[PDB]
Nucleic acid binder design. Structure first.
Lengths: 185, 490
DNA sequence: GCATGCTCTACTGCTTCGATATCG
DNA sequence: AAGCAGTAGAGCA
DNA sequence: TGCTCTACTGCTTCGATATCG
DNA sequence: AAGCAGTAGAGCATGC
């Protein structure tokens, strides 16, 4: 199907990005830009050996992604703007640019979704319609991250914002990533 | 049995008066009986085309059979229904066909008795096949053929019981002396009226009983039980177009080849591969690789736990539901476990869940087993046999997505008027009889081509409504319900 | 003691026939 | 294998 | 600026065919 | 799947 995919990788060992001023937007490097996915995208997925972590910030890569969407979108009309976030919510954050950035996503019509680690709240292998907590996995960083993503998502949608978070363990036996894409019938 | 065919001998009485018009000007019984025999052949040549059918007349002037009796004459012999045989049979219509019958063999002689049934027995005997049902249809009007002798009466009532001893069943289709049943006589020895069933109702049907799969159900890993997975509805369609030569009208026997690699010569399946193309790159696999990459299991029914009969809606289905039955052929004693499981699931209204793989290599499919209990009465209404129904289920890319976003309610006045409308249009649905129009038109088209009764009968569209009757049955409230809330109003 | 002669279930396979999947 | 609405590039206001 | 024809074109669907129990 | 025909791996019996 005629689509376009663009991937942002934040927290690598190099800061090459369309906008990066100082320690703001540090260690943000896009892998492959807005492209029809050929096998080179899968080659770049298989060239992902390093975590290579010097993490700076993550609530700014969304601003970079929307700005490269605005820069590239000239005549290429997209009916929707879907942005996924993949993290485990264990590093620290920056609560300054949250209200204005939520207002800009409200005025630019972005559909965002969030993917979560193993611990939402015997052999917990991959997914078996089972539990989520190994014994108890949440610390204060997961507490603050889970509550800010819950409040951001309920202010973005409502009740379904609480439903617009999904765990890695049960998203393999569902297609919750395949929502709000296909033109209906 | 399964390869067991069934037979029918049509015995026709033409002694003295049925060849006559019986002092009437309405309907003659001889042409009536020939109409009924031709109708039975026409129905069964497209309904059940492997059975055995024959015609015999008795009481005629001539005589021809295998043992040379007197006044017994046959016309066809025990075989399949044939177009040549009905085009031979239909010559006896009207008074002109009656006189043609008179010059062909002549009506009127001393009709004998039970040795005609002896000739029917000799027709039933010498056939090298398997026979399931043996019935004799007797077309006659005389209800006392022994007006002068007791010896032929005794030999009739003895030979009929002798044919009953080896299982032969005759059933006379009674004629009428004034037009209705009035000859209330005492055949309470020979036999074990209504001829519209021989006329009308078997224009489209087929005959079979098979099993479609014999599988095993695995409860844990090690406690398995044999079941057979029968079918109940199968969407019957028209027989295939046999290829034929234009001039001589024989089968063609086409043959296929693959060749021409810019060398001429020939090719072979070992010299070729399968491939797919994705933008630029092509991927090359083999036929065995294509066959192998769809594999998940071995064929069977894996148990996966029990479920209450609420969550599965009947809105969810994907295929004509099958019907599983237990049998004591593979594993001895499975009827016990199936009857016990059926009784427990029947009292506690719980359905089973299974993973289902039909044959030796098919990716798996989730099925749900729902039990059902039997019914019968004095008329033997076996409409429900006991056993489990296999409701299919979708997975994720069968339930599509609708636009879903429109909502405006309605005012509480129209619901009672529509209740009145549907209560005026309220009747029983059916038990049967909603026949296929395109298949039925093809059936009648194929009927009127090998007989050259040219006139192609237009098929009765039974599915169509009758708006000229339904307007008056409904009543003059159409425009009332229109201008109530939804006027056209330009 | 190895070589040849009757004989008994019974395993593989041919044939039809109906359903299912696939392609045009 | 074969028909039914979608959508733009000329023919015509 | 405003209207019209039509030139395919995906999205279907019967119908012919290859396989399997 | 249902039916049915066939032959072979083997088992008892006798011999220069």
């Amino acid at each position: 199907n005629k689509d376009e995919i663009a991937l942002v990788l934040f927290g690598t060992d190099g800061t090459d990005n369309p906008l990066s001023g100082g320690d703001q937007y540090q260690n943000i490097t896009v892998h492959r830009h807005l492209m029809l996915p050929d096998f080179d995208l899968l080659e770049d997925i298989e060239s992902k050996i390093q975590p290579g972590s010097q993490q700076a910030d993550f609530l700014d890569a969304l601003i970079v992604s929307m700005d490269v969407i605005q820069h590239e979108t000239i005549g290429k009309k997209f009916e929707k703007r879907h942005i996924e976030i993949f993290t485990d919510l264990s590093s620290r954050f920056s609560k300054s640019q949250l209200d204005i950035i939520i207002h800009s996503l409200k005025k630019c019509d972005i559909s965002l979704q969030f993917f979560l680690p193993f611990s939402l709240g015997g052999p917990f292998r991959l997914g078996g319609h089972g539990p989520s907590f190994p014994l108890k996995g949440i610390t204060e960083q997961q507490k603050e991250g889970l509550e800010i993503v819950k409040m951001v998502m309920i202010s973005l949608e409502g009740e379904d914002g609480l439903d617009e978070i999904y765990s890695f363990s049960e998203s393999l036996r569902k297609l919750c990533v395949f929502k709000k894409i296909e033109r209906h019938s | 049995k399964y390869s067991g065919r069934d037979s029918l001998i049509f015995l026709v009485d033409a002694s003295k008066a049925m060849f006559e018009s019986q002092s009437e000007d309405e309907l003659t019984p001889f042409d009536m009986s020939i109409q009924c025999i031709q109708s039975v052949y026409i129905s069964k040549i497209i309904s059940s085309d492997r059975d055995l059918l024959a015609v015999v007349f008795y009481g005629t002037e001539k005589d021809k059979n295998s043992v040379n009796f007197k006044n017994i004459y046959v016309l066809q012999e025990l075989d399949n229904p044939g177009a040549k045989r009905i085009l031979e049979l239909d010559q006896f219509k009207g008074q002109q066909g009656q006189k043609r019958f008179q010059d062909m063999m002549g009506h009127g002689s001393d009709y004998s008795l039970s040795e005609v049934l002896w000739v029917c027995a000799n027709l039933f005997s010498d056939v090298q096949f398997k026979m399931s049902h043996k019935r004799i249809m007797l077309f006659t009007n005389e209800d006392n053929p022994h007006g002068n002798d007791s010896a032929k009466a005794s030999r009739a009532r003895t030979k009929a019981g002798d044919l009953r001893d080896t299982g032969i069943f005759l059933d006379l289709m009674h004629l009428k002396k004034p037009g209705g049943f009035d000859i209330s006589l005492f055949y309470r020895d020979i036999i074990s009226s209504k001829l519209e069933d021989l006329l009308r109702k078997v224009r489209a049907k087929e005959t079979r009983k098979r099993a479609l799969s014999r599988l095993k159900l695995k409860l844990n890993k090690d406690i398995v039980i044999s079941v057979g997975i029968y079918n109940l509805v199968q969407k019957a369609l028209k027989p295939p177009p046999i290829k034929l030569y234009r001039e001589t009208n024989e089968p063609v026997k086409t043959k296929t080849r693959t060749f021409n690699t810019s060398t001429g010569g020939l090719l072979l399946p070992s010299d070729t591969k399968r491939s797919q193309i994705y933008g630029s790159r092509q991927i090359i696999l083999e036929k065995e690789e294509t066959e192998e990459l769809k594999r998940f299991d071995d064929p069977g029914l894996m148990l996966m736990g029990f479920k209450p009969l609420v969550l599965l809606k009947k809105h969810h289905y994907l295929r004509p539901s099958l019907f599983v039955y237990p049998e004591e052929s593979l594993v001895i004693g499975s009827s016990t476990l199936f009857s016990a499981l059926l009784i427990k699931c029947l009292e506690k209204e719980v359905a089973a869940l299974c993973r289902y793989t039909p044959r030796r290599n098919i990716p798996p499919y989730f099925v749900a087993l729902v039990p059902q209990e039997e019914e019968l009465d004095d008329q033997k209404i076996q409409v429900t046999p006991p056993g489990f129904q296999l409701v299919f289920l979708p997975f994720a890319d069968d339930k599509r997505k609708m636009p879903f976003t429109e909502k405006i309610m309605a005012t509480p006045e129209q619901v009672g008027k529509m209740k009145a409308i549907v209560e005026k249009l309220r009747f029983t649905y059916r038990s049967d009889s909603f026949e296929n129009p395109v298949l039925q038109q093809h059936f009648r088209n194929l009927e009127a081509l090998a007989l050259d009764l040219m006139e192609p009968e237009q098929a009765v569209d039974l599915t169509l409504p009758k708006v000229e009757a339904m307007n008056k049955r409904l009543g003059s409230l159409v425009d009332e319900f229109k201008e109530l809330v939804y006027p056209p109003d330009y």
